C-alpha cells in the first residue's frame, strides 16, 4: 500500500544513509555535509561561498555541459543550500529518473575538478550572487551581527567578502573539499526512495572516505556592536546574547520564549496579540514597523534576542520598548497560558514545516548528520511541552544578564547604542 | 613504428620554425579551438609563448634567424598547447553530438 | 521499486459532494497530522464594475479584522492561540481565504472560514484605517515594475473591458468606497453556488462535509440565487502601452497573444511549449549550457537580467507570452531573440525539445502539490475552473499525448501572425515600433 | 575685513557636545600590513592637562629623527622592537579637540606579528604609567617638543597656521617663551599620571589589515 518506517544505516567509514519511501511521484535526494564559512580562515575566506556556486563546473566523471543538459534532460533540478556550518547538495526529479540525476549529485560532491579557467570564469559571479542577496537589508545586519557577536568560526560571513572576490584558488577549493567533505561528516538522506538502493549506491560509489579533516575552531563570544549609517528610511536592529546550542537542554526553552515574545505573524495584515513583543512595541511607537524573537542554534553555540524594522525616527522608542518587554518577561511576566499557547504554535509550526518535500528532507537530514538518529515526532513533542513556566522566564533572564552584541543598518541617527539599553 | 620516428625528426628540421625559436604549437593557425585552448594556458606559459612569437616576428621583419645554437631541438620542443587543445575539441565533439540527440 | 507510473494512482482520490445551497465541498485526505482548508470564491476584479473597482480587495483587507460573532481582538486571539495560520488573497477572477492548522481543529476552523465570508463585521472605524493602508500598498506596489507591467499588459490587452482592471482598484475607489458597497459586494458575490470548501491533509471528508452543513447554512429560495451568472466576454486588442522613464535602472517588457481559457485542452500543449522556452535569471548555474535556447543566448550575449514565459488562463480567455527585464541597451536584441524563439515554436520544434519539455512540466505539476496549502489551492481552483478535479494521473496522459508536430500546430494556431499586446516600462527607447514587433510574428 | 565681509554676527549652529563611545571597529581586508590604533580619551585643547600628554607623547616616541634610524629616545619603539622581529613602526598618537581629545599609540606591523606588537606597545605604556619615566626622559622630551614646535613655524604655512589657530580659539597670541615656560613646567608626575589615565580609561581601538592575528580591545 503505502506507509511505514524510515531506515537509517550507518556504513563502515561513518557515512550515514537515511531513507524514507512515501510513494510520492517524485524523489528528492540530498547530500548533507558539515562544512561552511565556519571552517574558513582569514587565509581562505569566501572559499566556501564559491564552492557553493561551483557546483555546475566539470567533474572527473561529468562535464560542465552534461551536468546541466543531463539533469535538465529529465526535468530534474539541482541546488546547494548552506548555513555557516552545513552544506546540502540536493536534486529532485520524477521517480524513474533518480539513478540518472544521481550520477551528477555523486560527481559534483565527490569528484570535482575545479579547473583553473572554469574557476576563474566563475569567480566574478560571487560579485552578483552576493548583490542580489544584499538587496534585503534583512541579510546585511545578520552578516554583521554574527561578526560583532563572535571572534571566529561563526563570526565568518556567509557571503565571500569583497576583497577576496577573484583571489580564491583552485587549490583552496580542493583542499577545502578534501578536508571537509569526508565520509564521517557526510550523510546521504533521501525521500521517495527505497533504503536498499540509496544504500547500494552510497557503498560502491562514495569514494572520499573516512576522516574528520579540519576541525572547526571553538566559537568564542565577542559581544560587540557593529553599526552601519547608510541613509535608509528604515533602521534594522538585532540585539542578541549568547543563546543555546544545537540540541542543548536549554535549547527548547528559548524556542518557546521565542513564541511567547512573538515570532512571525499568522494573520495576513493582522496584529499579533499572542505576540507580547509586537504588542508592547506597538504601544510604544506610532508609525509602521515589525519586531520579532530571533533564535539561532549552532553546533557549539547559539544566538537569541529580538530584531526590529522601524522608521529611522521611531527607532529609539522601538528598540527600547522591545527591551523592557524582554525584561518584563524575564521577571515572571509569563502566564502559565502564554507558555501553553506558545507550546502549540511551536508544535504547529514544526509540523507544517514538514509538508514541503524540501522541509521533510531537511528534517530527516539534519538529524542523520548531527546525531545519526531520527527523533520520532512524538518525542520532540514530549520534549517541547516538558518546558516549565520557569525555564522560559529563566531564558529571558539569561538575556537581560548576559553581554549583548547588537547590529543595526539604516539611518541610525536616532538609533541607540548597546550601552544605552 | 620507429621509422617515421626518424621521418618526423626530419620533417621537423625540414619545416625549420625552430630557426625562429618557435615551438611546434607556437605555429598553429589560431582557429576557434586553438583560441579557446590558449585562453586556458597558465599565465606564464602564455607570456612565454607571447614573447617567443613577437621575437620570431621581429626576426622575420629583419629578415634574419636565430644563431644555430638557439634553434629549438626536435626533442626539446614543448607541446604545451596540445593537451588543452585536445580537450577543447573533445568537449565540443561532445556538445556537438549531444545536440543532435 | 514502485514506479512513477503507479505512485500516480496510489494518490488518494478527491472527494466531492455538493450541498443543497450550491456550495461544493471537496478534499484530498492524507496521513498528515497538520493540514489546510479554506473557501475558494469565484469572485474578482473582473466582477467589479467601474464604480466599485477594488471592493473585493478592500474586503480582502477586512476579512480578518473581525466578524459579528467575535470582534477583532477576540477573532485574532482565537486564531493565533491555536497555532493556525489564516491567509488568503484576491485576483481578477478568484478570491480565496484559507487556514493552516492541525488536522484536529479542522471543524472549529470551518466555522471560522464560514464566519468570515458570511458575517464580516465591517466596522465603520476599521474601514477608515484600511483606507490609508491600501493607499499605502498602492504606493509600494507602484514600485514593483513586474507588477506595474502585467497590469499595464492587461490594461491594454483587454482595454475597454473588465479584465483591463487592476485588482487593487483606482485611487478614487479606495478613497470613497462605502460600508455599503463593501457590504453589497460580499452579499452579491460571496455566495454558496460560487464557493468551494477545499480541504487537504489528515481530514475525513465526512466530518468536513458535516461541519459545512452546520455552519454553511442559509438556503436559497428563488432560482436567481442558485444561478451562476455568466460574465460578459472581454475583448482582446493587439496594441501597446509604453511607460517611459529613463530614470529607471532597467526596463521591463511583456508581450502576449490571446489565450483560450481554462477549459481548452490546448492549454496543456501551450504549457509544454512554454517549457521548451522556459525561463532565466542571472543566478541560474547552468549558464551558457542551459537547454533553453533563449536562456543560452541570454547568457552568450547578456541580453537580460531575467525572463519568463507565462500562460495566464481565465474562464473565457487568457494571455500567452513572455516578460524580460534588461538593461536599456539590450532590450532590442533580447526581444528579437525572444520573438525568434516563438517563431521557432510554430515552425521547427523537435521531438527532442518536447520530450524534455514534458519531463519539466511533469515535475512542474507535481511541484504544485507539495504541501496541504498547494494541494488545497489546486482543488479549490480545479473545481471552480475545470468543473471538478484533474488527477496527476490524468494530466500526465494529456502531456504524454503531446508531440513536436502537436506543439507546432497549437503555437501556430495562437502565435503565428497574430497582433500582440505589448507593455513596456522604463528606459525603453531602444525597443521600438509596434510595426517592427508585429512583423516579428512571422517567418521562422 | 571690515568694509568687505558680509555673512554676519552669531554663533549659528552649535556643535553637539562630543560624547565618548569607546568601541572598536575592525576591517579585514587582506593587507600584509595591519594598522592599529588603541587610544582613550585624551586632553582637550587648552586643558592644562594637555601639555602633559604632548610630553608623554615624546617620551614614548613620536616620529623618527634619524633617516632609517632606530629611535632609542623612543621607549615605545624600543620596547616594541624587543618584542617583534620583522619590520614595523609604532608611535604616540595625540589629538587635542575643542571639547575633547584622543591619545594612545599606533602600530604598523606584519599581519603575523601584530599580536606581539600591539601587546608590547601596551606593557610599554603601562610600565610608563608606573614611574617608568626618568627625570631625564622628561628632560629630553621637553626639548624635542620645544624643538619640533619651533621648526613647525619655519614654513610660511606653519607660521600662518600658528598665528591663526590662536586668534580663533582664543583671540590672543601666546608668546613663544610663554609656551616654553608652559611646556617645561610639567612634572615627572603629570606625565606618569597621563600614562595612568590611559591604562585606566575605557579604550576604543581601530584596526585595518589582515586582522587574523590581531587582538581585540578586550584582550589587552
Residue in the block written with cell 501556430: C412
Range of the domain at C428: 239-442
Residue D105, all three cell numbers: 599609540
Q: Are A350 and A271 in contact (CB under 8 A)?
A: no
CA angle (D28, D31, D36) in 5-degree steps: 65
Does C222 share its domain with C302?
no
Question: Cβ contacts (< 8 Å) between C393 and chain A: which residues?
Answer: none
Tell me if A352 and C85 make a contact (CB, 8 A cut-off): yes
Helices (H), C278-371: 293-300, 331-348, 351-366
CA distances in angstroms from D90 to D30, D124, D201, D215, listed in the order given:
20, 11, 21, 16
Q: Are A291 and A246 in contact (CB under 8 A)?
A: no
Rounded-to-integer distance, Cα A146 and Cα A37, Å: 11
Residue in the block written with cell 552568450: C300
- The 3-state DSSP composition of chain B as helix, strand, coil percent (nearest 5) reads 65, 0, 35
Does C429 share its domain with C335?
yes
Question: Cβ contacts (< 8 Å) between B91 and chain A: which residues?
Answer: 63, 65
Q: Are A329 and A261 in contact (CB under 8 A)?
A: yes
Q: What are φ and ψ of residue A17, in 5° steps?
A: -135, 125
Residue in the block written with cell 571552517: A39
Q: Are A194 and A19 in contact (CB under 8 A)?
A: yes
Please tell me the CATH code under which domain B1-101 is placed.
Answer: 1.10.1090.10
User: Which sign, positive or negative, has the C-alpha torsion C224, C225, C226, C231?
Assistant: positive
B73 CB-near residues (< 8 Å, 6+ apart): B18
Chain B nearest C-alpha distance from A373 (Å):
43
Q: Are A203 and A133 in contact (CB under 8 A)?
A: no
Rounded-to-integer distance, Cα D208 and Cα D114, Å: 11
Residue of A nearest to C352 (CA): A73
Q: What Rg, from alpha-carbon coordinates, does chain B have?
A: 16
CA A185 and chain centroid, separation: 17
Q: By C-alpha distance, which of C331, C335, C332 is closest to C322?
A: C335
Tell me if C363 and A26 make a contact (CB, 8 A cut-off): yes
Q: Does D207 touch chain A (CB under 8 A)?
A: no
3-state secondary structure of C94: coil
Does C206 share its domain with C265?
no
Q: By C-alpha distance, which of B17, B28, B48, B47 is closest to B88?
A: B28
Burial class (CB in 10 A: 0-12, 13-18, 19+), D72: exposed
Q: Are A45 and B75 in contact (CB under 8 A)?
A: no
Q: By C-alpha distance, which of A229, A213, A209, A46 is closest to A129?
A: A46
CA D134 and chain centroid, separation: 20
**Diameter of chain D by CA atoms?**
63
Rounded-to-integer distance, Cα C235 and Cα D48, Å: 87
DSSP A135-177: TSHHHHHHHHHHHHT-SSGGGS-SS--GGGTT---HHHHHHHH
Burial class (CB in 10 A: 0-12, 13-18, 19+), D199: middle
State the number of CA atoms in the 13 A half-sphere of C119 facing the CB.
17
Which residue numbers of C are catalytic?
Answer: 60
Contacts 24+ apart (CB under 8 A), D6-13: none
D15-74 residues touching A, CB cutoff 8 A: 21, 23-25, 28-30
Does C243 share its domain with C219?
no
Q: By C-alpha distance, which of D61, D57, D54, D52 is closest to D79?
A: D61
Residue C176 lies in a domain: yes
Rounded-to-integer distance, Cα C417 and Cα C410, Å: 13
Rounded-to-integer distance, Cα A44 and Cα C302, Å: 31
Q: What are φ and ψ of residue C364, in 5° steps?
A: -70, -45
* Local structure of residue C231 (DSSP, 8 states): P
Does C267 share its domain with C184?
no
Q: Which of A65, A69, A116 sits opposite B91 (nearest CB)?
A: A65
Does C277 share its domain with C190?
no
Residue C8 lies in a domain: no
* H/E run at residue C88: strand C85-90
Residue C232 lies in a domain: no
End-to-end, the C-alpha distance of chain A in Å comes to 60
Residue count of chain D: 220
Task: Count Cβ neighbours within 10 Å for each residue of A226-254 and write b for 16 or more, e otherwise.
Answer: bbbeeeeeebbbbbbbbbbbbebeebbbb
Of C197, C227, C257, the one marking the end of a domain is: C227
State the number of CA atoms in the 13 A half-sphere of D3 facing the CB.
0
Rounded-to-integer distance, Cα D168 and Cα A37, Å: 54
Tell me if C83 and A349 make a contact (CB, 8 A cut-off): yes
Residue of B nearest to A120 (CA): B40
Rounded-to-integer distance, Cα C318 and Cα C46, Å: 13
Q: Are D209 and D114 in contact (CB under 8 A)?
A: yes
Rounded-to-integer distance, Cα C204 and Cα B38, Å: 68
Tell me if B39 and A117 make a contact (CB, 8 A cut-off): yes
Tell me if A65 and B98 make a contact (CB, 8 A cut-off): yes
Does C221 share its domain with C244?
no
Of C227, C250, C265, the one marking the end of a domain is: C227
Rounded-to-integer distance, Cα A308 and Cα A239, Å: 9
β-pairing verdict for A301-311 and A234-242: antiparallel
User: Which sign, positive or negative, has the C-alpha torsion C210, C216, C222, C226?
Assistant: negative
Residue count of chain A: 421
Q: Are C154 and C164 in contact (CB under 8 A)?
A: yes
Which of A60, A66, A169 to probe the B interface (max B CBs under 10 A)? A66
CA distances in angstroms from A14 to A108, A182, A212, A375, A393, listed in the order given:
20, 9, 10, 19, 40
Residue C50 lies in a domain: yes
Helix axis angle, A251-261 relative to A338-352, nearest 10°?
100
CATH code of the domain covering residue C424? 3.30.830.10
D171 CB-near residues (< 8 Å, 6+ apart): none
Question: Cβ contacts (< 8 Å) between B39 and chain A: which residues?
Answer: 117
Which of D22, D25, D26 to probe the A interface (max A CBs under 10 A)? D26
Residue in the block written with cell 550507518: A10
Rounded-to-integer distance, Cα A378 and Cα A358, Å: 21
Beta-bridge partner residues of C38: C98, C198
Q: What are φ and ψ of residue A19, in 5° steps?
A: -100, 155
Tell me if C1 and A272 make a contact (CB, 8 A cut-off): no
Q: How many CB atoms lie within 10 A of CB A29?
A: 24
Q: How many CB atoms lie within 10 A of CB D44?
A: 15
Rounded-to-integer distance, Cα C17 and Cα C108, Å: 20
Q: Which of A128, A194, A348 sits opposite C282 (nearest CB)?
A: A128
Does C333 share its domain with C381?
yes
Q: Are C271 and C435 in contact (CB under 8 A)?
A: no
A403 CB-near residues (< 8 Å, 6+ apart): A221, A223, A241, A242
Rounded-to-integer distance, Cα A124 and Cα A50, Å: 10
CA A296 and chain centroid, separation: 8
CA C284 and chain centroid, separation: 25
Question: Do the chains D and C touch each other, judged by at least 3 C-beta pairs below 8 angstroms?
Answer: no
Q: Are C18 and C402 in contact (CB under 8 A)?
A: no
* Local structure of residue C67 (DSSP, 8 states): B
Does C183 share its domain with C50?
yes
Q: By C-alpha distance, which of B92, C297, C286 is closest to A122?
A: C286
CA angle (A73, A75, A80) in 5-degree steps: 100
Rounded-to-integer distance, Cα C132 and Cα C144, Å: 19
Q: Does A270 touch chain C (CB under 8 A)?
A: yes
Residue in the block written with cell 504606493: C139
* Local structure of residue A218 (DSSP, 8 states): P
Q: Are D214 and D34 in contact (CB under 8 A)?
A: yes
Residue A248, all three cell numbers: 542543548
Residue count of chain B: 101
Question: Which experimental approach was used here?
Answer: X-ray
Q: Are C178 and C124 in contact (CB under 8 A)?
A: no
End-to-end, the C-alpha distance of chain B in Å comes to 39
Q: What are φ and ψ of residue A293, in 5° steps?
A: -90, 120
* Local structure of residue D14 (DSSP, 8 states): -
Does C23 share its domain with C127?
yes
Residue in the block written with cell 590672543: D172
* Local structure of residue D203 (DSSP, 8 states): P
The number of domains in chain C is 2
Tell me if B91 and A69 make a contact (CB, 8 A cut-off): no
Question: Cβ contacts (< 8 Å) between D28 and chain A: which residues?
Answer: 42, 45, 161, 163
What is the number of H-type helices and E-type strands within chain D?
A: 7, 5
β-pairing verdict for C421-426 and C239-244: parallel
Rounded-to-integer distance, Cα A8 and Cα A364, Å: 10
User: Which sign, positive or negative, has the C-alpha torsion B50, B55, B61, B64?
Assistant: negative
Rounded-to-integer distance, Cα A390 and Cα A155, Å: 31
A185 CB-near residues (< 8 Å, 6+ apart): A33, A34, A35, A211, A212, A213
β-pairing verdict for C196-201 and C24-29: parallel
Residue in the block written with cell 634567424: B65
> Resolution to 1 decimal, in Å?
3.1
Residue count of chain C: 444
Q: Are A270 and A264 in contact (CB under 8 A)?
A: no
- In chain D, DSSP assigns E strands to 25-28, 33-41, 88-97, 100-110, 204-209
Q: How many CB atoms lie within 10 A of CB A114?
A: 21
Q: How many CB atoms lie within 10 A of CB B19?
A: 18
- In C260-314, DSSP assigns E strands to 279-281, 306-313
Q: Are C42 and C195 in contact (CB under 8 A)?
A: yes
State the number of CA atoms in the 13 A half-sphere of C114 facing the CB.
20
Beta-bridge partner residues of A112: A59
Q: Does B92 touch chain A (CB under 8 A)?
A: no
User: Where along chain B do its domains lie?
Assistant: 1-101
Question: Cβ contacts (< 8 Å) between C287 and chain A: which residues?
Answer: 56, 68
CA dihedral C110, C113, C114, C116 (to 10 degrees): 160
Q: How many CB atoms lie within 10 A of CB C219?
A: 11
Please, which chains are in contact with A (at least 3 CB pairs closer than 8 A)?
A: B, C, D
3-state secondary structure of A345: helix
Q: Does A143 touch chain D (CB under 8 A)?
A: no
CA angle (C211, C214, C216) in 5-degree steps: 90
Residue of A nearest to B90 (CA): A63
Q: Are D114 and D213 in contact (CB under 8 A)?
A: yes
Residue of B nearest to A115 (CA): B40
Residue A411, all three cell numbers: 539611518
Residue C7 lies in a domain: no
Q: Which of A346, A348, A355 sits opposite C371 (nearest CB)?
A: A355
Q: Which of A45, A151, A163 sits opposite D216 (nearest CB)?
A: A151
User: Which sign, positive or negative, has the C-alpha torsion D163, D165, D169, D175?
Assistant: negative
Q: Does A66 touch chain B (CB under 8 A)?
A: yes
Does C208 share its domain with C293?
no
Residue of C nearest to A22 (CA): C7
End-to-end, the C-alpha distance of chain C in Å comes to 45
- In C235-289, DSSP assigns E strands to 239-244, 251-258, 279-281
Rounded-to-integer distance, Cα D74 and Cα D59, Å: 6
Does C433 share its domain with C290?
yes
Residue of B nearest to A117 (CA): B40
β-pairing verdict for C279-281 and C306-313: antiparallel
Question: Cβ contacts (< 8 Å) between A132 and chain C: which residues?
Answer: 282-283
Which domains can be identified in chain D, with CATH numbers? 20-220 (3.30.830.10)
Q: By C-alpha distance, which of A38, A22, A18 is closest to A30?
A: A18
Rounded-to-integer distance, Cα A232 and Cα A410, Å: 5
Rounded-to-integer distance, Cα D207 and Cα D108, Å: 10
Q: How many CB atoms lie within 10 A of CB A131?
A: 11
Q: What are φ and ψ of residue C5, in 5° steps?
A: -35, -40
End-to-end, the C-alpha distance of chain D in Å comes to 53
Q: Are A240 and A304 in contact (CB under 8 A)?
A: yes
Residue C47, all three cell numbers: 466582477
Q: Are C37 and C98 in contact (CB under 8 A)?
A: yes
Q: By C-alpha distance, which of D53, D35, D41 is closest to D195?
A: D53
Rounded-to-integer distance, Cα C23 and Cα C193, Å: 5
Q: Does A116 touch chain B (CB under 8 A)?
A: yes
Residue of A nearest to D29 (CA): A163
Task: Count Cβ neighbours within 10 Å for each residue of C164-195 and write b for 16 or more, e otherwise.
Answer: bbbbbbbeebbeebeeebbeebbeebbbbbbb
CA angle (A247, A253, A256) in 5-degree steps: 115
Residue C302, all three cell numbers: 547578456
Residue in the block written with cell 533580447: C334
Q: Are D101 and D45 in contact (CB under 8 A)?
A: yes
Residue B23, all three cell numbers: 615551438
Tell me if A65 and B39 make a contact (CB, 8 A cut-off): no
Q: By C-alpha distance, which of A368, A381, A51, A370 is closest to A191?
A: A368
Q: Does A70 touch chain C (CB under 8 A)?
A: no
Of C227, C259, C276, the one marking the end of a domain is: C227
Question: Cβ contacts (< 8 Å) between A69 and chain B: which residues?
Answer: 98
Q: Are D77 and D71 in contact (CB under 8 A)?
A: yes
Q: What are φ and ψ of residue C389, in 5° steps?
A: -115, 140
Amino acid at each position: 500500500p503505502g506507509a511505514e518506517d524510515l531506515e537509517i544505516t550507518k556504513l563502515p567509514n561513518g557515512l550515514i544513509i537515511a531513507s524514507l519511501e512515501n510513494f510520492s511521484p517524485a524523489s528528492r535526494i540530498g547530500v548533507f555535509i558539515k562544512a561552511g564559512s565556519r571552517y574558513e580562515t582569514t587565509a581562505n575566506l569566501g572559499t566556501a561561498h564559491l564552492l557553493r556556486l561551483a557546483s555546475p563546473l566539470t567533474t572527473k566523471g561529468a562535464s560542465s555541459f552534461r551536468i546541466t543538459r543531463g539533469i535538465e534532460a529529465v526535468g530534474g533540478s539541482l541546488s546547494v543550500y548552506s548555513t555557516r556550518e552545513k552544506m546540502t547538495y540536493c536534486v529532485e526529479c520524477l521517480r524513474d529518473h533518480v539513478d540518472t540525476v544521481m550520477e551528477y549529485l555523486l560527481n559534483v560532491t565527490t569528484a570535482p575538478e575545479f579547473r583553473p579557467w572554469e574557476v576563474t570564469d566563475l569567480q566574478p559571479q560571487l560579485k552578483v550572487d552576493k548583490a542580489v542577496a544584499f538587496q534585503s537589508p534583512q541579510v546585511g545586519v545578520l552578516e554583521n551581527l554574527h561578526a560583532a557577536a563572535y571572534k571566529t568560526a561563526l563570526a565568518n560571513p556567509l557571503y565571500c567578502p569583497d576583497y577576496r572576490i577573484g583571489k580564491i584558488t583552485s587549490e583552496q577549493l580542493h583542499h577545502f573539499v578534501q578536508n571537509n567533505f569526508t565520509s564521517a561528516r557526510m550523510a546521504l538522506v533521501g525521500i521517495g526512495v527505497k533504503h536498499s538502493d540509496l544504500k547500494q549506491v552510497a557503498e560502491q560509489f562514495l569514494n572520499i572516505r573516512s576522516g574528520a579533516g579540519t576541525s572547526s575552531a571553538k566559537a568564542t563570544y565577542w559581544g560587540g556592536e557593529i553599526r552601519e549609517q547608510n541613509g535608509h528610511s528604515l533602521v534594522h536592529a538585532a540585539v542578541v546574547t549568547e543563546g543555546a546550542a544545537v540540541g542543548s537542554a536549554e535549547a527548547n526553552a528559548f524556542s518557546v520564549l521565542q513564541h511567547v515574545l512573538g515570532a512571525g505573524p499568522l494573520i495576513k495584515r493582522g496584529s499579533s496579540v499572542t505576540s507580547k513583543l509586537y504588542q508592547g512595541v506597538a504601544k510604544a511607537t506610532t508609525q509602521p514597523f515589525d519586531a520579532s524573537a530571533f533564535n539561532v542554534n549552532y553546533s557549539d553555540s547559539g544566538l537569541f534576542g529580538f530584531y526590529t524594522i522601524s522608521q529611522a525616527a521611531h527607532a529609539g522608542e522601538v528598540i527600547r520598548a522591545a527591551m523592557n518587554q524582554l525584561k518584563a518577561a524575564a521577571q515572571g511576566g509569563v502566564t502559565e497560558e502564554d507558555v501553553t499557547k506558545a507550546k502549540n504554535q511551536l508544535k504547529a509550526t514544526y509540523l507544517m514545516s514538514v509538508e514541503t518535500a524540501q522541509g521533510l528532507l531537511n528534517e530527516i537530514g539534519s538529524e542523520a548528520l548531527l546525531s545519526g538518529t531520527h527523533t520520532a515526532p512524538s518525542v520532540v513533542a514530549q520534549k517541547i511541552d516538558s518546558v516549565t513556566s520557569a525555564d522560559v522566564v529563566n531564558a529571558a533572564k539569561k538575556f537581560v544578564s548576559g553581554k549583548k552584541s547588537m547590529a543595526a543598518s539604516g539611518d541610525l541617527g536616532s538609533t541607540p547604542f548597546l550601552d544605552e539599553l | 613504428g620507429r621509422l617515421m620516428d626518424r621521418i618526423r625528426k626530419w620533417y621537423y628540421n625540414a619545416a625549420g620554425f625552430n630557426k625562429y625559436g618557435l615551438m611546434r604549437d607556437d605555429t598553429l593557425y589560431e582557429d576557434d579551438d586553438v583560441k579557446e585552448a590558449l585562453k586556458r594556458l597558465p599565465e606564464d606559459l602564455y607570456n612565454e609563448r607571447m614573447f617567443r612569437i613577437k621575437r620570431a616576428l621581429d626576426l622575420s621583419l629583419k629578415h634574419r634567424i636565430l644563431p644555430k645554437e638557439q634553434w629549438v631541438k626536435y626533442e626539446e620542443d614543448k607541446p604545451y598547447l596540445e593537451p588543452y587543445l585536445k580537450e577543447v575539441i573533445r568537449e565540443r565533439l561532445e556538445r556537438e553530438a549531444w545536440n543532435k540527440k | 521499486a514502485a514506479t512513477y507510473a503507479q505512485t500516480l494512482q496510489n494518490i488518494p482520490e478527491t472527494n466531492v459532494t455538493t450541498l443543497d445551497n450550491g456550495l461544493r465541498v471537496a478534499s484530498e485526505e492524507s496521513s498528515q497530522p497538520t493540514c489546510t482548508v479554506g473557501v475558494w470564491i469565484g469572485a474578482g476584479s473582473r466582477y467589479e464594475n467601474e464604480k466599485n473597482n477594488g471592493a473585493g480587495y478592500f474586503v480582502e483587507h477586512l476579512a480578518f479584522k473581525g466578524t459579528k460573532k467575535r470582534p477583532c481582538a477576540a477573532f485574532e486571539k482565537e486564531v493565533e492561540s491555536m497555532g493556525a495560520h489564516f491567509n488568503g488573497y484576491t485576483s481578477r477572477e478568484q478570491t480565496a481565504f484559507y487556514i493552516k492548522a492541525l488536522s484536529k481543529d479542522m471543524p472549529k476552523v470551518v466555522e471560522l472560514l464560514a464566519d468570515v465570508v458570511q458575517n464580516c463585521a465591517l466596522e465603520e472605524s476599521q474601514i477608515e484605517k484600511e483606507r490609508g493602508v491600501i493607499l499605502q500598498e498602492l504606493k509600494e506596489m507602484d514600485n514593483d515594475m513586474t507588477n506595474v507591467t502585467f497590469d499595464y499588459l492587461h490594461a491594454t490587452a483587454f482595454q475597454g473591458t473588465a479584465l483591463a482592471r487592476t485588482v487593487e482598484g483606482t485611487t478614487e475607489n479606495i478613497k470613497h468606497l462605502t460600508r455599503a458597497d463593501l457590504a453589497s459586494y460580499i452579499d452579491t458575490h460571496f455566495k454558496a453556488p460560487r464557493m468551494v470548501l477545499a480541504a487537504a491533509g489528515g481530514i475525513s471528508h465526512k466530518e468536513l462535509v458535516d461541519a459545512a452543513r452546520q455552519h454553511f447554512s442559509g438556503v436559497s429560495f428563488t432560482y436567481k440565487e442558485d444561478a451562476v451568472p455568466i460574465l460578459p466576454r472581454c475583448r482582446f486588442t493587439g496594441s501597446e502601452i509604453r511607460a517611459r522613464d529613463d530614470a529607471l535602472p532597467v526596463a521591463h517588457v511583456a508581450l502576449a497573444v490571446e489565450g483560450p481559457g481554462w477549459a481548452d485542452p490546448d492549454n496543456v500543449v501551450l504549457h509544454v511549449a512554454n517549457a521548451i522556452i522556459g525561463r532565466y535569471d542571472r543566478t541560474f548555474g547552468g549558464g551558457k549550457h542551459l537547454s533553453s535556447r533563449l536562456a543560452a543566448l541570454a547568457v552568450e550575449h547578456k541580453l537580460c537580467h531575467s525572463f519568463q514565459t507565462f500562460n495566464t488562463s481565465y474562464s473565457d480567455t487568457g494571455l500567452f507570452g513572455f516578460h524580460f527585464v534588461a538593461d536599456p541597451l539590450s532590450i532590442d536584441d533580447m526581444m528579437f531573440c525572444a520573438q525568434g524563439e516563438w517563431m521557432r515554436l510554430c515552425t521547427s520544434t523537435t521531438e527532442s525539445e518536447v520530450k524534455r519539455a514534458k519531463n519539466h512540466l511533469r515535475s512542474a505539476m507535481v511541484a504544485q502539490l507539495d504541501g496541504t496549502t498547494p494541494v488545497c489551492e489546486t482543488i479549490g481552483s480545479h473545481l471552480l475552473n475545470y468543473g471538478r478535479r484533474i488527477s496527476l494521473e490524468e494530466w500526465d496522459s494529456r502531456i504524454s499525448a503531446v508531440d513536436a508536430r502537436m506543439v507546432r500546430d497549437v503555437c501556430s494556431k495562437y502565435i503565428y501572425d497574430k497582433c500582440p499586446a505589448l507593455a513596456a516600462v522604463g528606459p525603453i527607447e531602444q525597443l521600438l515600433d509596434y510595426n517592427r514587433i508585429r512583423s516579428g510574428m512571422y517567418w521562422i
